[PDB]
Amino acid sequence: YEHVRRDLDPNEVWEIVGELGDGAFGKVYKAKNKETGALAAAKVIEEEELEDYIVEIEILATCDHPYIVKLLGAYYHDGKLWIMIEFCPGGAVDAIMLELDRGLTEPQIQVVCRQMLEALNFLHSKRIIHRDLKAGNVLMTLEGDIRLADFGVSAKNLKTLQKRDSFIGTPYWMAPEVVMCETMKDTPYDYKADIWSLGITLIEMAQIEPPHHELNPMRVLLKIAKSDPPTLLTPSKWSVEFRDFLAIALDKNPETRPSAAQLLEHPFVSSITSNKALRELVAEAKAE
Ligand SMILES: Cc1cc(Cl)ccc1CNC(=O)Nc1ccc2cc1OCCOCCNc1ccn3ncc-2c3n1
Ligand SMILES: [Cl-]
Numbered sequence: 001y002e003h004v005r006r007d008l009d010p011n012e013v014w015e016i017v018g019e020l021g022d023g024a025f026g027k028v029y030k031a032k033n034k035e036t037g038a039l040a041a042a043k044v045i046e047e048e049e050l051e052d053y054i055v056e057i058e059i060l061a062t063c064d065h066p067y068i069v070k071l072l073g074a075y076y077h078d079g080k081l082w083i084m085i086e087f088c089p090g091g092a093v094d095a096i097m098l099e100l101d102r103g104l105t106e107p108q109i110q111v112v113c114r115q116m117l118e119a120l121n122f123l124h125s126k127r128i129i130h131r132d133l134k135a136g137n138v139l140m141t142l143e144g145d146i147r148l149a150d151f152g153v154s155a156k157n158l159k160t161l162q163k164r165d166s167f168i169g170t171p172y173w174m175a176p177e178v179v180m181c182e183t184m185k186d187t188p189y190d191y192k193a194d195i196w197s198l199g200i201t202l203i204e205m206a207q208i209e210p211p212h213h214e215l216n217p218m219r220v221l222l223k224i225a226k227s228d229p230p231t232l233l234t235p236s237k238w239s240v241e242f243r244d245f246l247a248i249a250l251d252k253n254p255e256t257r258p259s260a261a262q263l264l265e266h267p268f269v270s271s272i273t274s275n276k277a278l279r280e281l282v283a284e285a286k287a288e
Contacts, residue, residue, distance in 0.1 A: 003057050003061045008075060009075075010077055014034070016029045016030075021095075025166075026166065029042040029044060040084045041069070042085065044080050045080065050081060053083075055154045063122070065119060069147045069148065070086040071084070088147050089140075090139065090144075092138065092139055093138045097208050102208070105277065111278040113202060113268065113269050113272075114269040114272035115145060115146040115275075116133070117269060121260035123194070124260060132173070134204065134210070140281075140282050143279065144277075144279030171221075172224075173201060174221075175196035176224050176252045195257050195258060195260065196250060199229075199249035199250040231246065231247075244266075
């Protein structure tokens with residue numbers, strides 16, 4: 001009830017004008033304010049079902065942090081659920097890498113890492129786990145800041161996803177302790193799963209693709225569980241600080257794995273006080 005209206009027909013304010021891409025629960029649309037020309041991202045999802053999607057709305061409604069996409073409004077009108085979300089004009093980091101046909105520089109990765117850790121430290125304070133970190137779910141502003149989007153869905157919506165034969169892709173970023181899991185238990189170290197995913201996200205940004213990228217998807221699950229933690233392919237190309245950060249983050253034991261707060265003290269990120277590296281990257285991509 002709290003964050004979803006049944007009164008205003010969205011079409012009065014918002015026009016669906018395009019597609020931005022595909023998330024974990026289908027299409028993400030571009031929406032335009034008809035009077036001002038101001039932009040939003042949007043879900044438009046065709047009473048049982050209405051209740052199930054609300055869990056996802058409550059996550060964005062609950063977060064007041066710059067590095068998590070804002071909820072602008074939610075409407076139920078004519079059998080459709082509209083979720084209006086902050087538009088990130090820089091787009092997804094994996095799209096930037098596709099557009100420029102290369103990985104991020106270390107300074108670019110350091111800005112992304114610093115901001116992702118601040119977001120994750122905030123999320124742990126709310127006892128919210130993202131559950132699906134990857135470069136495709138890290139969005140950019142033109143000013144050069146990140147926004148996390150596409151929070152991992154509920155048990156109910158994963159059920160509806162499988163019953164309608166939709167994917168969310170091979171889980172290359174998944175922590176070893178939960179790679180065989182359809183749904184995860186509530187545990188004291190559940191939230192540590194995002195720290196592993198952050199480590200894999202950094203490697204994906206360094207090398208364009210995550211580890212085990214071409215393995216059979218069932219073999220990926222086994223490799224994540226069984227393999228030594230992944231390292232950068234060419235360690236000589238990256239600072240000792242980057243490699244050390246990855247080595248402490250990609251701990252297969254979720255108890256000993258550091259928290260976001262602990263990793264914010266690491267020299268790889270503790271002195272990152274400018275987003276300029278990322279501002280310039282987004283400027284490069286917007287040119288292409
Ligand atoms: C809310 C909700 C409800 C239900 Cl019931 C189920 C799941 C979810 C969670 N899904 C999202 O938060 N998706 C999302 C929400 C917003 C955006 C992107 C999103 O995903 C990733 C899509 O791929 C990237 C496509 N390029 C861009 C470019 C700019 N921008 N600016 C915002 C988003 C975005 N996407
Ligand atoms: Cl989505």
